[PDB]
Design a protein around this ligand. Structure first.
Ligand code: HEM
Ligand code: HEM
Ligand SMILES: Cc1cc(N)nc(CCc2cc(CCN(C)C)cc(F)c2F)c1
Ligand SMILES: Cc1cc(N)nc(CCc2cc(CCN(C)C)cc(F)c2F)c1
Ligand SMILES: C[C@H](O)[C@H](O)[C@H]1CNc2nc(N)[nH]c(=O)c2N1
Ligand SMILES: C[C@H](O)[C@H](O)[C@H]1CNc2nc(N)[nH]c(=O)c2N1
Ligand SMILES: [Zn+2]
Lengths: 411, 416
């Protein structure tokens, strides 16, 4: 059946037909909704063929050639390859289409208006961790583009037997280290304390600073991972200052310009790309709200409210909310002053509503996760707060996967 | 369906285990393939038959006798027997006063969209099931408002009017809330007052209300007893406590002429207890500041004051990345909390309320086996991730007794 979504501010109603084409589960049932659960819970020739067939079918439907001679040949081509080799290889055109549509189907991504402008780097000929490092450096250099950031994904060889996996062990390509101090506290980024310990334990010489770029830790073909330092001229960073508060620069805050998720799994046509680092540009709140002001991250709210001279004795002064707005003004001002691409949550959510309109008209829907789409501050003064959304799982897709250090049989 | 489900807090690492979900009784709207968790609302002449009513009454009576540690007792089996006979001979049954009070408190406790549930057991229940006329409803509602307001030391309360019988004799409060401000559409398309209330305001005017046509006019009560046409009553103004909004720092803020009423009182929901349907059950608590400061004042479709406040703050308003909206929103919400506290009218900030709810949720998990919660509604509409609930995984499911939505009465009423 058709489903309607209403925007309660504009009264616009859209009609979702696209959800009828999903087949993966959400985790909800008729009686329990798991919409706020962050993670709700190796193929064979038998499982693999219908998945391949479905993906080839939708690809040739997208290029307006369904049932063509090319379509029929590809289906037969893929048939004997799965049969004779227990897997199959995507054509270049299919790889690019599959990566763009995995972005397009990412229900948690507010940046999807850009989905078809994605640079795809085919790295399926990679065999070693040195090769992976070379591919990753080129990605970072291309996507950074001197501050005019460009969306990119680099796709390493697919999973075969589960024993020869390609994995980027870093959760993101560029992150700051985290150090557990003698006096029990934490220097740097606390969310990376464990990973930083694994890099130290592998030979990394930590400068033990507050913003130390972590080395890369790269696993090729199931071997033990190897450390590599990204050349510093490739790591673009932004000193954070405030347009009105000249004391803000004295806080000593910086961040990196390139957000690049490297720990997810790209599923296309039943194939699993366990190493597929992808990157875009930041929404300001990612840095200013979550990275800086989470109690479990850099946790700077009290310090800023200190130099703002705010009364911090009771919650109802909203001192936290005041300091939060100023932190996020500075992040946007800093990136913009340095001509590094960044989007504020007002522009981003507005673009996403426009994206939603587009997708409903030309595609019949747009899967979207309100819990992730609504920004972590000022929710209801952004237009996505008032937008009903339907969440469902379409393929090709990005999926979560286990941390590699919980599964890697060392040697 | 799995027996144990785990929820995690991603800020504190605390893991909780839910078994209460196995008692869920009605549908969420989600399926195995689609989640409707952000959908706001996923015939009234149809009433429960004898055969639908029997198991629903037994379920609730069993639950009540279990709560009082008398499950399987003589009084439990006798009450089952007496209820079953009543349904057989009359097609319905009447709740004892103790069961009515238990059911109302538990409908609140079960309200997955309510962040204020740490208070659920402290609820004053007024039994108005002997009411017969709209004048009597007005008396009961006035007594509710005065008790709940308590000169600013607000007390949560519910007043329960007679249950549905055949569906042609419903009691309804036509107001969605007991205290709201009127909205007036102008010929030029602008709106005076609260634009959310234009439809209901026009109904009141058609029913005889003489509108003062101001920015903050308390609407009359529009009250329907026993399925008759509804009747208009003016709430005595001395019973409507109101707070003028001023700012601790910006002396010009009072010059905006803003105020709000102290008592939030929902009057359009349906209370279901043991299969009985209480279509008029106004309930009231006290406000979380963001309800006024963020939604009532700053939604574009409501009073929409961000622009005017930003001007008086002399903020750069040409680019959105100055965050001038965010900056003015904080100052508006500071003024709302400051004005209420200064006048000694109960209010809770969104930091304190969400912290209390986490503690409530943890206690419910430990003592009750779970706590249904709707993240989309629990997380406040500003500063989301600097409140603890943002980081809390929540399971949403529908337990009974419950508060439910029901059609708007003007869409279903048969005019005499
Ligand atoms: C182009 C600019 C982009 C912007 C402004 C943007 C914005 C965002 C934001 C704010 C989130 C939430 C992140 C979090 O809170 O952890 C997100 C999630 C996500 N984005 Fe985008 N994004 C962009 C590009 C991309 C690209 C290029 C891809 C893949 C090709 C992508 C795929 C995803 C996925 C899979 C998620 C979900 C991540 C998860 O579940 O942890 N995004 N995006
Ligand atoms: C005592 C202090 C209370 C506080 C601080 C509080 C807080 C809230 C808030 C902030 C909401 C969201 C409202 C909205 O965004 O429209 C809400 C919803 C709700 N509350 Fe509470 N509440 C309180 C008392 C009560 C009481 C006494 C009841 C019933 C006996 C109740 C039942 C509900 C229900 C059913 C909803 C859902 C409303 C809807 O779906 O429109 N609450 N509450
Ligand atoms: C493609 C893309 C674009 C964009 N704008 N944002 C992202 C997410 C980026 C990202 C997420 C995290 C999770 C941390 N979370 C707990 C707050 C950590 C990072 F270091 C990081 F860079 C991806
Ligand atoms: C018992 C109780 C306590 C509490 N703190 N809040 C409530 C909700 C009150 C309420 C809701 C609405 C819906 C409009 N929404 C978009 C903001 C309008 C109102 F006028 C109103 F008073 C109930
Ligand atoms: C419990 C809840 O699912 C969790 O905190 C989510 C909420 N929404 C989010 N939204 C985004 N964009 N990113 C996040 O990490 C989260 N965390
Ligand atoms: C579309 C979305 O469900 C809608 O805007 C919701 C979001 N969360 C909410 N949360 C509360 N407390 N009150 C609301 O009215 C809403 N509205
Ligand atoms: Zn759901």
């Amino acid at each position: 059946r058709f489903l309607k979504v209403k925007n309660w501010e504009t009264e616009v109603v859209l009609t979702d037909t696209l959800h009828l084409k999903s087949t993966l589960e959400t985790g909800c049932t008729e009686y329990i909704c798991m919409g706020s659960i962050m993670h709700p819970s190796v193929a064979t020739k038998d499982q693999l063929f219908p998945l391949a067939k479905e993906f080839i079918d939708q690809y040739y439907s997208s290029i307006k050639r369904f049932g063509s001679k090319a379509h029929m040949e590809r289906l037969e081509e893929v048939n004997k390859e799965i049969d004779t080799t227990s897997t199959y290889q995507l054509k270049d055109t299919e790889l690019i289409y599959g990566a763009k549509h995995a972005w397009r189907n990412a229900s948690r991504c507010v940046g999807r208006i850009q989905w078809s402008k994605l640079q795809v780097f085919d790295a399926r000929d990679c065999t070693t961790a040195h090769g992976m490092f070379n591919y990753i450096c080129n990605h970072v250099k291309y996507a950074t583009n001197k501050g005019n950031l460009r969306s990119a994904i680099t796709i390493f060889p697919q999973r075969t037997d589960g024993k020869h996996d390609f994995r980027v062990w870093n959760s993101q390509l560029i992150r700051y280290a985290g150090y557990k101090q003698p006096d029990g506290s934490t220097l740097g980024d606390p969310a990376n304390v464990q990973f930083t310990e694994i890099c130290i334990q592998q030979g990394w010489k930590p400068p033990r600073g507050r913003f130390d770029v972590l080395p890369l830790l790269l696993q090729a073909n199931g071997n033990d991972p190897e450390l590599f330092q990204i050349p510093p001229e490739l790591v673009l960073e932004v000193p954070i200052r405030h347009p009105k508060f000249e004391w803000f620069k004295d806080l000593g805050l910086k961040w990196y310009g390139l957000p690049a998720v490297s720990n997810m799994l790209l599923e296309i046509g039943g194939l699993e790309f366990s190493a597929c680092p992808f990157s875009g540009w930041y929404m300001g709140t990612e840095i200013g709200v979550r990275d800086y002001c989470d109690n479990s991250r850099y946790n700077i709210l009290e310090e800023v409210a200190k130099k703002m001279n705010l009364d911090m004795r009771k919650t109802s002064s909203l001192w936290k909310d005041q300091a939060l707005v100023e932190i996020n003004i500075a992040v946007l001002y800093s990136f913009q002053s340095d001509k590094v691409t960044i989007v504020d949550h007002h522009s981003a959510t507005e673009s996403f509503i426009k994206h939603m309109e587009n997708e409903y008209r030309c595609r019949g829907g747009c899967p979207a996760d309100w819990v992730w789409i609504v920004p972590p501050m000022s929710g209801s003064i952004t237009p996505v707060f008032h937008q009903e959304m339907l969440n469902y799982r379409l393929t090709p897709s990005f999926e979560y996967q286990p941390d590699p250090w919980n599964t890697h049989v060392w040697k």
